[PDB]
Amino acid sequence: MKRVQPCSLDPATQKLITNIFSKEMFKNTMALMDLDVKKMPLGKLSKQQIARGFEALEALEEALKDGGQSLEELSSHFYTVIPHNFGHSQPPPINSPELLQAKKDMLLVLADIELAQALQAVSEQEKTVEEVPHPLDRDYQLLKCQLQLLDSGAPEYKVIQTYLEQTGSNHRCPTLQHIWKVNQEGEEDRFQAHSKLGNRKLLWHGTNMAVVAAILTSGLRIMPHSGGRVGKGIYFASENSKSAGYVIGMKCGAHHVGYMFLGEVALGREHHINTDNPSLKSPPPGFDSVIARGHTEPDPTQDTELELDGQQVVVPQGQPVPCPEFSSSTFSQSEYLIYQESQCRLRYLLEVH
Ligand SMILES: C[C@H](NC(=O)CCc1nc2ccccc2c(=O)[nH]1)c1ccc(S(N)(=O)=O)cc1
């Protein structure tokens, strides 16, 4: 009988680790994506199944763009590979770009749920040691990501709170509960490659609770089937309200808990666009980033800076104001795009209610 060592984590961090590895959380997310958890339990999810789903979506995409299989037949194959639940009615045929991308996105999220399950598999060294860490220590250790909870008077704390408050929704701004500093080392080496590149900004990235463990383990990633209104890159926002739209939170007790990242992004020379371009795979030549510019932007006259690893990083502090040059943009709020994973380092994780 092995000893369970006492937990080293503070209460807030124990809660985070409980939440981002929660089996209920993961199954709730699968239900929210219309998956049939009975047919596709967490422990049964595999990389092969996910890869087969992407092959089925690739066939669908080719059909959508002959005498090949019907969209219904090809949809049926996808739905056999990745079981869905629509209260035991037929699932719907995947017959639009929008629905195709929504299934790609679902699988990208499912891939990160499978990553978290794979991470948790018990190693052989763990079966042999006579003492084990507390389970929340074990789970924290698996991330290979240093988290340090910040208190009120950490130098950046007020700056981050201000960014959240001034750029979050005016009527029901998310309520800040915790901030952690995030150090995923060996993001370090690849990030140091952009050390010459100025124009760094701290930007919001909101996400599903179900992908937080994966992000902490592996950083923000660009995968083969990722897409959106500015193409195949990593998406950020300068307005918390925009990123908060992507936060899938979870009911815990009387409240709704969600997580948002702050990334330091080396934007370099910006290419500004004012119309959607879902086909982009890089900036144009001589540019380091693409900014889909919104009707509004956090008032640039109120920008401050933080010093992170000896570099100045801009942090907006202003309420959003109108930008006359982009009053006719297809974007209400800006989307900031990088097309190399190396141009972002995770810096902070916020718990918001
Ligand atoms: C489908 C899901 N996408 C998101 O979570 C997008 C979240 C998001 N989109 C934004 C778009 C514009 C501006 C801001 C954001 C943002 O803050 N989050 C996703 C989840 C996981 C992955 S992975 N496993 O390839 O690293 C990729 C994509």
Curated annotation (Swiss-Prot):
GO cellular component, one term: nuclear body
Residues with PTM ADP-ribosyl glutamic acid: E55, E130, E131, E165, E270
Post-translational modification summary for this protein: Auto-mono-ADP-ribosylated.
UniProt entry tagged with the keyword Nucleus: yes
Subcellular location: Nucleus; Chromosome; Cytoplasm, Cytoskeleton, Microtubule organizing center, Centrosome; Cytoplasm, Cytoskeleton, Microtubule organizing center, Centrosome, Centriole
Keyword Cytoplasm included in the entry's annotation: yes
Activity regulation comment: Mono-ADP-ribosyltransferase activity of PARP3 is selectively inhibited by ME0328 compound; ME0328 does not inhibit other ARTD/PARP enzymes, such as PARP1. Mono-ADP-ribosyltransferase is strongly inhibited by KU0058948 compound.
EC number: 2.4.2.-
Expressing tissues: Widely expressed; the highest levels are in the kidney, skeletal muscle, liver, heart and spleen; also detected in pancreas, lung, placenta, brain, leukocytes, colon, small intestine, ovary, testis, prostate and thymus.
Domain PARP alpha-helical: 6-121
Keywords: ADP-ribosylation, Chromosome, Cytoplasm, Cytoskeleton, DNA damage, DNA repair, Glycosyltransferase, NAD, Nucleotidyltransferase, Nucleus, Transferase
Tree of life domain: Eukaryota
UniProt GO molecular function: catalytic activity; NAD DNA ADP-ribosyltransferase activity; NAD+ poly-ADP-ribosyltransferase activity; NAD+-protein mono-ADP-ribosyltransferase activity; NAD+-protein-aspartate ADP-ribosyltransferase activity; NAD+-protein-glutamate ADP-ribosyltransferase activity; NAD+-protein-lysine ADP-ribosyltransferase activity; nucleotidyltransferase activity
ADP-ribosyl aspartic acid PTM sites in chain numbering: D34
Reaction(s) catalysed by this chain's protein: L-aspartyl-[protein] + NAD(+) = 4-O-(ADP-D-ribosyl)-L-aspartyl-[protein] + nicotinamide; L-glutamyl-[protein] + NAD(+) = 5-O-(ADP-D-ribosyl)-L-glutamyl-[protein] + nicotinamide; L-lysyl-[protein] + NAD(+) = N(6)-(ADP-D-ribosyl)-L-lysyl-[protein] + nicotinamide + H(+)
Family statement: Belongs to the ARTD/PARP family.
Subunit structure: Interacts with PARP1; leading to activate PARP1 in absence of DNA. Interacts with PRKDC. Interacts with XRCC5/Ku80; the interaction is dependent on nucleic acids. Interacts with XRCC6/Ku70; the interaction is dependent on nucleic acids. Interacts with EZH2, HDAC1, HDAC2, SUZ12, YY1, LRIG3 and LIG4.
Entry function: Mono-ADP-ribosyltransferase that mediates mono-ADP-ribosylation of target proteins and plays a key role in the response to DNA damage. Mediates mono-ADP-ribosylation of glutamate, aspartate or lysine residues on target proteins. In contrast to PARP1 and PARP2, it is not able to mediate poly-ADP-ribosylation. Involved in DNA repair by mediating mono-ADP-ribosylation of a limited number of acceptor proteins involved in chromatin architecture and in DNA metabolism, such as histone H2B, XRCC5 and XRCC6.
Descriptive protein name: Protein mono-ADP-ribosyltransferase PARP3
Residues of the full protein shown: 178 to 532 of 533
